[model samples]
Target: GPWGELVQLDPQTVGVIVRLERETFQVLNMYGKVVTVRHQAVTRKKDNRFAVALDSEQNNIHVKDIVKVIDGPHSGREGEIRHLFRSFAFLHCKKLVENGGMFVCKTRHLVLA
Candidate 1:
């Protein structure tokens, strides 16, 4: 499946970071698939947050929001949001079984702070 079908997995969900780059991003899908895609166009706000297109509705998930992994391999872990995208967000999760780094999460899975 692709972006369209992928959205159905967890519309407005958060993602777990699988990989990151200067101009690219890779995240674990709700279905456990690794997806890499170019960064979406967004505008950086003065508040250290970025604004971008969300789902059919333009719901905004702010940065620094506390979240927890409700599903996937990293379930039950808590994290702080550092970035946001359409249906995806990057969380600063630490104390993980895996080394600490940015974890991608579906916005829906995250509990807003």
Candidate 2:
């Protein structure tokens, strides 16, 4: 399976090189579920919370009431959900590691509930 999407870490976090591994085995175990991947739409105030848009059957998932952030570079990042939506977060090219003038990318998967 592909590595899925790559999300960039918070720039303010000092000295933390995060490289997350794929979670196919676990995802397979929990297949056919309604899991969400609330992403960070915009960063504003320290306590300004987030702006997540729900990607499930229900579309009222606000950024403040995010149940979980199942994917992205910020998977383990210490933060709150800003909105509820599909967990299709991908890292921008600027933060990617280049080798031999090539950029590495990852593929993502969505759960079938």
Candidate 3:
């Protein structure tokens, strides 16, 4: 399976990050407790699935925005937004375990840098 998105950690709080939307992510804090957050707000995509909050796209993610994956398979990784699309964007990240291997992600899983 692909190692998905990269989530960045808060420098002050190792286990704290903002929620994006959907049932985007789940993480284990230092105590090994699972924390899950879901967006109370969402919109139906053309594909007939709930997506990130509606305004998430307005005045939202931009090129060069430093971002972290708040959810998804790539939790707890850090990167920058390299490009944007209608509903998602490409994230450029370096993998620590992969000797800094490049990791690209989507906007649905990212937050402001």
TM-score of each: 0.46, 0.22, 0.40
Q: Which candidate wins on lDDT?
A: 1
> Model 1, stretches more than 4 Å misplaced?
1-48, 52-60, 97-99
Better of 2 and 3 by TM-score: 3
Ranking by TM-score: 1, 3, 2
TM-score of 2: 0.22
Better of 1 and 3 by lDDT: 1
Model with the higher lDDT, candidate 2 or 3 = 3
Any runs in candidate 2 off by more than 4 Å, and if so which? 1-52, 56-59, 76-79, 82-113
Compared with the true structure, model 3 gives a TM-score of 0.40
lDDT of every predicted structure (CA atoms): 0.52, 0.25, 0.42
Off by more than 4 A, model 3: 1-59, 94-101
Local distance difference test, candidate 3: 0.42
Error of 3 at 27 (Å): 29
User: Candidate 2, after superposition: displacement of residue 103 in Å?
Assistant: 24
Residue 102, model 3, lDDT: 36
lDDT of 1 at 111: 60
Candidate 2 per-residue lDDT over residues 1-113, each given as its tens digit: 11222222234311111222333111100111212222332122232224343333444333333233234433322222321223422122223342111121111221112
